[PDB]
Amino acid sequence: CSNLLLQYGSFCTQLNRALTGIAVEQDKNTQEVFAQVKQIYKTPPIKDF
Amino acid sequence: QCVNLTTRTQLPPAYTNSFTRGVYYPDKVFRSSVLHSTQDLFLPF
Numbered sequence: 500c501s502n503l504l505l506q507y508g509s510f511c512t513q514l515n516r517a518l519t520g521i522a523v524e525q526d527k528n529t530q531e532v533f534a535q536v537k538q539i540y541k542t543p544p545i546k547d548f
Numbered sequence: 549q550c551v552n553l554t555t556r557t558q559l560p561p562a563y564t565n566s567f568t569r570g571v572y573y574p575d576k577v578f579r580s581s582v583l584h585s586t587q588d589l590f591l592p593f
């Protein structure tokens with residue numbers, strides 16, 4: 500079956516390319532939402548707000 | 549006729565690294581500027 504699938508080849512190369520693009524896009528989405536800033540601020544010990 | 553040979557000297561069998569060797573044409577078709585993939589009996593690199 501692998502030998503027979505060999506002569507298709509380009510089809511699941513295309514599929515893997517598409518899925519990798521999707522995964523990279525997911526990481527991009529999370530970064531662009533949450534990594535708006537880069538200075539990791541932290542709260543002061545005193546909560547005198 | 550045939551004669552058995554006597555003068556000999558045995559040694560441990562010699563071994564070597566075959567790297568990027570043992571590749572032959574798969575068919576008889578003129579393919580140029582194409583990266584083609586195939587599966588056959590091949591000498592592993």
Ligand SMILES: *[C@@H]1O[C@H](CO)[C@@H](O)[C@H](O)[C@H]1NC(C)=O
Binds near residue numbers: 550551552553
């Ligand atoms: C020696 O030669 C004979 C016949 O010529 C053959 O039968 C025999 O197998 C040979 N032996 C060896 C060790 O070559």
